[PDB]
Amino acid sequence: DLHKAMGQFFDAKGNIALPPQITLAGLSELFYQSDVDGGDRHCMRYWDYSTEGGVARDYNRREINTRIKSVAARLQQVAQPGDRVAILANNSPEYLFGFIGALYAGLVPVPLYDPSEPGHADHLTAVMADAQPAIVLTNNASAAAVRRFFSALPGAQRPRIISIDSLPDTLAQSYQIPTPSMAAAAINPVDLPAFLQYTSGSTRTPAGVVLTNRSIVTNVLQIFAAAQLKTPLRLVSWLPLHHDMGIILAVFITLLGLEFEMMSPRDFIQQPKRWIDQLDRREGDNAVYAVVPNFALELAARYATPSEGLDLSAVEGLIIGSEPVTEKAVEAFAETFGPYGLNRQNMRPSYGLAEASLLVTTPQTPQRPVISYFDREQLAANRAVIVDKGDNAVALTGVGQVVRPQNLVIVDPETRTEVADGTIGELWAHGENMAAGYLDRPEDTAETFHNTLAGRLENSRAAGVPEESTKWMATGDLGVIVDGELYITGRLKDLVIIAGRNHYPQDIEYTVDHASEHIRPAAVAAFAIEGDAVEQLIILAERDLDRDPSGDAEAIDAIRAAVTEAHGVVPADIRIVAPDEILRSSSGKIARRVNKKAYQESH
Ligand SMILES: Nc1ncnc2c1ncn2[C@@H]1O[C@H](COP(=O)(O)OP(=O)(O)NP(=O)(O)O)[C@@H](O)[C@H]1O
Ligand SMILES: CCCCCCCCCCCCCC(=O)O
Ligand SMILES: [Mg+2]
């Protein structure tokens, strides 16, 4: 019984109490051992699309557990609890067996990517120099790429490379449960590092978010209690496992023994119908869940055209997040798939970040998905005033409520004081899901994780937190709470501020998209760069798939006029490029800061 199992850690007041000895792996094994009679239950289906039709690999409860313990036992022949180990593989069952197997051995995994995928050499080099793992877990498909990545080092300095699907299951029988130290010094197991999450999309040197057993276990409990899950369920995901959103979701589902169906982002992008087909109702189905970034809604709405017989009525939650969720994308999806059983009320925009482990807010009322319209001028002055659709209005999507126990406060970053609901500020979070810091980065850790709330409102969203706490996490994200609902406006650092007015890229990007059918839907990056004595607005946009460069001139003129009229700024530059030329993350989403850097290095 899952719901009781997860409730054992809550108290009457809704507070979480974790025993000092609990770890992520200990929780996983506790649930597995309680799942008497569950060993033969189907738990994971992996789609290999080396061929176009694809071949499924299936694993039941027992097989997953055995693979995990085989990995752990092998690690215990060559390493100690606390050692770091990089995971360098494509999305695959081995990726998960390696990550969780490291946890079982008390090692600290570092989820990374297949190094043969382009665009990671600098990143991987920096991560390896930062975390310095002596061991790499990989699979047979990726092992050559891994061996080559390290071929410029002295052989004696290369990490040991372990290919998980070369390990026999006879290893599992020698796995040993790590025992806690008795010392004096001793950090409790629950407070030890669980894994290191290096995020992507930034041009700066990678920083390792240190997630502890406490961090993750707390967020797993917060997620479970807030998501109002219908069990049993299956979760469909193609998210990259080296992304915060991908790996925690897969681990959440695996630790609870629920059903998980996985492919790689490239499989979705090349044939989005594969994803819609996976959400289609199957005979055994009870509840189906999915988690995607915003752009995927537009891609599927256009390119996963539905057939007679498609039945999406089993989809109980379509979580959308990791980037601004747009009205345009939500409605295109709802309109395309609503006639085939997709309940619009089950679209659930949500917000989080690695520094909070995974999830900060998600809809916890029936009022979702929320779309609200705000006066653009007031918004540019940090005030949210609800207006009627389509009269100088900015459409923003509600991402729900904080997942307790946890506080979410809107804070003036200049004065570090709470602001009233309806006032735009920086989101600050407080709770035991927060990460411990950035690995070996004391000042960056202090800036992001060790903030003090200098002042609060009479009715404070910080209620329950000691007034002197120095543990507020400043997200770097701007937003506002209106009528109890959180809205994300943009990243603080990437605000477009021109002549004393704040402009939000997502707002500008809608104007650009809407300004001409020459532009590929949702394929716009708007950002500011420093000019002579002011900030310049730069706009990059791909022309749609069927369009010729001869239409660029017209689209540019139309984009310029539309943006000037709606926002009162004449773009300094409007560049139109070919489809897929705008740089994107491994998940497929536009990587704005990476594009901005590339533009500056071309001037
Ligand atoms: N629903 C959302 N709406 C708008 N933005 C979101 C949403 N969900 C996540 N984000 C943004 O994604 C961020 C969290 O992404 P994360 O996976 O932690 O790495 P990252 O911030 O993109 N890269 P880095 O600069 O290295 O930290 C938040 O801080 C938001 O900026
Ligand atoms: C069974 C599925 C329910 C799980 C819902 C929690 C997932 C929410 C994802 C939030 C994404 C933002 C994280 C990020 O961008 O780093
Ligand atoms: Mg960040």
* Residue 320 CA to ligand 2 centre (angstroms): 8
Binding site membership of 272 for ligand 1 (Cβ less than 6 Å): no
Q: What is the C-alpha separation between 18 and 9, in angstroms, rounded?
A: 6
C-alpha pair distances (Å), 601 with each of 575, 584, 585, 597:
15, 17, 19, 6
Contact status, residue 395 vs residue 371, Cβ threshold 8 Å: yes
Amino acid at 4: K
The H or E element spanning position 468 is none
- Name the closest-CA residue to atom 6, ligand 1: 323
Q: Which atom of ligand 2 is nearest to the CA of 233?
A: 1
Residue 412's DSSP bridge partners are 417
Give per-residue burial for 198-236: e unless 16+ CB within 10 Å, then b. bebbeeeebbbbbbbbbbbbbbbbbbbbbbebeeebbbb
Residue 87's DSSP bridge partners are 111, 137
* Residue 450 CA to ligand 3 centre (angstroms): 16
383: Cβ contacts below 8 Å, ≥ 6 apart = 422, 423, 424
C-alpha pair distances (Å), 391 with each of 422, 442, 489:
19, 47, 19
Nearest to 559 by CA among 353, 567, 256, 54: 567
Nearest to 502 by CA among 514, 485, 520, 490: 490
* Residue 235 CA to ligand 1 centre (angstroms): 22
* Residue 334 CA to ligand 3 centre (angstroms): 29
Helix (H, G, I), strand (E, B) or coil at 425: strand
Q: Virtual CA dihedral for 261, 262, 267, 272, nearest 10 degrees?
A: 40
HSE on the CB side for 287, CA within 13 Å? 13
Q: Are strands 473-482 and 425-430 parallel, antiparallel or unpaired?
A: antiparallel
* Residue 360 CA to ligand 1 centre (angstroms): 11
- Domain encompassing residue 562: 496-600
Amino acid at 365: T
Contact status, residue 524 vs residue 539, Cβ threshold 8 Å: yes
Residue 487's DSSP bridge partners are 398, 480
Nearest to 189 by CA among 24, 65, 354, 31: 24
* CB-based pocket (< 6 A), ligand 2: 223, 227, 229, 235, 244-245, 289, 291, 317, 319, 321-322, 350, 352-354, 358-359
HSE on the CB side for 252, CA within 13 Å? 30
Amino acid at 539: I
* Residue 322 CA to ligand 1 centre (angstroms): 5
Contact status, residue 101 vs residue 151, Cβ threshold 8 Å: no
Contact status, residue 5 vs residue 38, Cβ threshold 8 Å: no
Q: What is the C-alpha separation between 199 and 218, in angstroms, rounded?
A: 20
Q: Virtual CA dihedral for 144, 146, 148, 154, nearest 10 degrees?
A: -130
* Residue 354 CA to ligand 1 centre (angstroms): 8
Binding site membership of 349 for ligand 1 (Cβ less than 6 Å): yes
Q: What is the C-alpha separation between 249 and 241, in angstroms, rounded?
A: 9
Q: Which atom of ligand 1 is nearest to the CA of 199?
A: 26
* Residue 152 CA to ligand 3 centre (angstroms): 31
**Resolution of the PDB structure in angstroms:** 2.0
Nearest to 242 by CA among 133, 97, 106, 91: 91
HSE on the CB side for 199, CA within 13 Å? 20
- Name the closest-CA residue to atom 27, ligand 1: 199
Q: For the chain, first and last CA: distance in Å?
A: 60
* Residue 246 CA to ligand 1 centre (angstroms): 13
Q: Virtual CA dihedral for 548, 553, 554, 558, nearest 10 degrees?
A: 120
Tabulate helix, strand, coil % of the chain (nearest 5): 35, 25, 40
Cis peptide before 405 (omega within 30 of 0): yes
Nearest to 59 by CA among 313, 259, 244, 231: 259
Binding site membership of 321 for ligand 1 (Cβ less than 6 Å): yes
What does the DSSP assignment read for 220-279? HHHHHHHHT--SSEEEEE---TTSHHHHHHHHHHHHTT-EEEE--HHHHHH-THHHHHHH
Amino acid at 102: A
- Residue 271 token pair: 């044939």
392: Cβ contacts below 8 Å, ≥ 6 apart = 375, 376, 377, 566
Binding site membership of 473 for ligand 1 (Cβ less than 6 Å): no
Residue owning tokens 């839907």: 521
**Using only C-alpha atoms, what is the Rg of the chain?**
24
Give per-residue burial for 456-467: e unless 16+ CB within 10 Å, then b. beeeebbeebee
Nearest to 89 by CA among 107, 70, 66, 71: 71
3-state SS, 28-88, equals HHHHHHHCCCCCCCEEEEEEECCCCCCEEEEEEHHHHHHHHHHHHHHHHHHCCCCCEEEEC
Contact status, residue 278 vs residue 261, Cβ threshold 8 Å: yes
Helix (H, G, I), strand (E, B) or coil at 473: strand
- Experimental method for this entry? X-ray
- Residue 391 token pair: 């009269």
Binding site membership of 351 for ligand 1 (Cβ less than 6 Å): yes
Q: Which atom of ligand 1 is nearest to the CA of 354?
A: 18
Nearest to 158 by CA among 117, 116, 121, 128: 128
Q: What is the C-alpha separation between 485 and 349, in angstroms, rounded?
A: 11
Pocket test for ligand 2, best of 256, 357, 358, 427 (most atoms within 8 A of CB): 358
What does the DSSP assignment read for 268-331? HHH-THHHHHHHS--TT-SEEEEEE-HHHHHHHHHHSPPPTT---TTEEEEEE-SS---HHHHH
